[PDB]
Ligand binder design. Sequence first.
Ligand code: A1L2P
Ligand code: A1L2P
Lengths: 128, 126, 126, 127
Amino acid sequence: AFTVTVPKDLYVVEYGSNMTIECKFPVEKQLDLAALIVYWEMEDKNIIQFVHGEEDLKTQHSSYRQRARLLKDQLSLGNAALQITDVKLQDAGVYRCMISYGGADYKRITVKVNAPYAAALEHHHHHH
Amino acid sequence: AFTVTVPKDLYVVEYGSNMTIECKFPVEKQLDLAALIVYWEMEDKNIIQFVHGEEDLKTQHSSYRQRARLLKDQLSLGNAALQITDVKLQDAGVYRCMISYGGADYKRITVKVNAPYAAALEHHHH
Amino acid sequence: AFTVTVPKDLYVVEYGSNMTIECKFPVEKQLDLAALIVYWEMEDKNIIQFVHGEEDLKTQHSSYRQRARLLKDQLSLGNAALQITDVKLQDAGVYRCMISYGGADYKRITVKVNAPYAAALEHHHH
Amino acid sequence: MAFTVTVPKDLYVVEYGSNMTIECKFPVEKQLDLAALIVYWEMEDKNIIQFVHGEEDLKTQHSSYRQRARLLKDQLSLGNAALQITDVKLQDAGVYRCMISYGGADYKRITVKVNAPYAAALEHHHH
Ligand SMILES: COc1nc(OCc2cccc(-c3ccccc3)c2C)ncc1CN1CCCC[C@H]1C(=O)O
Ligand SMILES: COc1nc(OCc2cccc(-c3ccccc3)c2C)ncc1CN1CCCC[C@H]1C(=O)O
């Protein structure tokens, strides 16, 4: 069966760091971008929609505008990698990588964000 | 772009009743069952996995056993209908219909379950 | 030790209905209103504050205005009864009755609200 | 002068495996009367501490807070209900409530965030 696999289902990241979360899918021979769909989301917020080679920010939340990208290089190697830059406390939660490629599956990834008092205080009072 | 559609994104159902939650997908010529994938879940629990024109029970959460059925006859009209029988308070929450058919999409449906005191008390203690 | 008791820790109420949720506290003979503090809340929202023998609804959450009242006759019988009118889906959740009377204690009460589609839909969008 | 509990910090950030003291202040005029003081500490409706007229009372204490939690009794005479929890775990993260009756009654909320490295986070993730 078409199986999406996650080498890590748990990421522990420092506030302000960069994170690449990886979802693997089978690619035999050459990638057919025309048949590939990748959706990345966290708790029903859309981060990435890559449908036949193009991305649509349509439901792409402002939270992930400027900070989230899919690493396109990795796609031909069967790696749908979400890179988030300048990780914030609001990025903690359960991510889903949803892949359709002649077959469909999704996996969940848990992200925990560690932060110092100063970042935690700002998030606490000014809710990001 | 391939779009899954839900006529109702909210269902309010009575404890003990039967419920059909429906999601639509475009079928603009003879349904190709071989290319259709339908996945139904609620809060990470698998209810239905319809691949290669048949259903796989190897994944059902065991809270949905004998209670969950996908209505196949409708797929040719582009309706992925989940029928749940003997609705329980545990069936309340956010459902997802995930469809792959030359394109892929999903929609969320919220189910609220109304129950009398007697049923609610049992669910409360457990 | 001073013990607050709740005969029912679970209430099931209809949208638009009325509800009286009760917490019991020990009273021997004359209630001393001067020493009695009763605070009722739900998820951090103040519903009722009876201090120095009078209701103090200057801390009441706006969601409970005109809808919430402590039955002051009941206090003399050792019953802190919160009566809520025109129950909304937002009223569902965990209530706490906090009592200070020569001693202090609290208990939790769960309220579930049954509602028709029309009320559920408005709550769903708001 | 309504009886007011005050928290100098409503947010604590603690490292996994460390010890934490979280504090709630209450008005004490002259000398504390232990006989009139009740302090309850709880987190998400689990009881951690019950101090009723001068002693601990395990009337509602949850088993997780067995030999991990104490009230600093010295601090009470200064009007400080200080909860010390030892060997902080990821499950100790959340909203704490200090409930004080001393003539009047009030409660305040304190948020604890627990930072943990991958090894501790992984154990919590599976267990
Ligand atoms: C996650 O559970 C499963 N979901 C699905 O379809 C999901 C699905 C169905 C339909 C559409 C999408 C989609 C994909 C990308 C974007 C939007 C939606 C998705 C994502 N098919 C099998 C299983 C389970 N099955 C057996 C156990 C191992 C893995 C898997 C397998 O080998 O296929
Ligand atoms: C928490 O809010 C309040 N709680 C209460 O009684 C609680 C209460 C009442 C009765 C008993 C206990 C208790 C104490 C210790 C243990 C168990 C229970 C408790 C804990 N009375 C006023 C306010 C509100 N008050 C006015 C304005 C806002 C804030 C506060 C203030 O400014 O003083």
